[PDB]
Ligand binder design. Structure first.
Ligand SMILES: Cc1cc(CSc2nnc3ccccn23)on1
Length: 125
């Protein structure tokens, strides 16, 4: 069974829009989204459809690019580092639940490499 997905708005949390956050949406997320290995990461893990009822028994801080995209569109984050941490959580969750060599892990590895290439240099404020 599936927990509620992470929040994509929070009215008591202050919003911000920076050149780096705009870039993370327009360039980094939107480019990764098109990768042939992005599809599993475009929405929250559906442990019910995948028939993996232990997924959320192991992963306690779930994240996916669908959530990230909606946060970025909401101006939910204060800075790029906060958003980059949610990408890192998403990749780390994958490596926690799965083992080296697994198809899903090869996909996460590939996207993480592309992610790091793209955030190596960000715009200036
Ligand atoms: C492809 C594929 C891999 C799996 C294994 S479960 C899993 N572990 N991390 C993620 C991330 C997204 C979708 C499924 N995930 O299901 N479909």
């Amino acid at each position: 069974m599936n927990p509620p997905p992470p929040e994509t708005s929070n009215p008591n949390k202050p919003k911000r829009q920076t050149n780096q956050l705009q870039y993370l949406l327009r360039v980094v997320l939107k480019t990764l989204w098109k990768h042939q290995f992005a599809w599993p990461f475009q929405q929250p893990v559906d442990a019910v459809k995948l028939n993996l009822p232990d997924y959320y028994k192991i992963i306690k801080t779930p994240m996916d690019m669908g959530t990230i995209k909606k946060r970025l569109e909401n101006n939910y984050y204060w800075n790029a580092q906060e958003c980059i941490q949610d990408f890192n959580t998403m990749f780390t969750n994958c490596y926690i639940y799965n083992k080296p060599g697994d198809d899903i892990v090869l996909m996460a590895e590939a996207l993480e490499k592309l992610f790091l290439q793209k955030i190596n240099e960000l715009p200036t404020e």
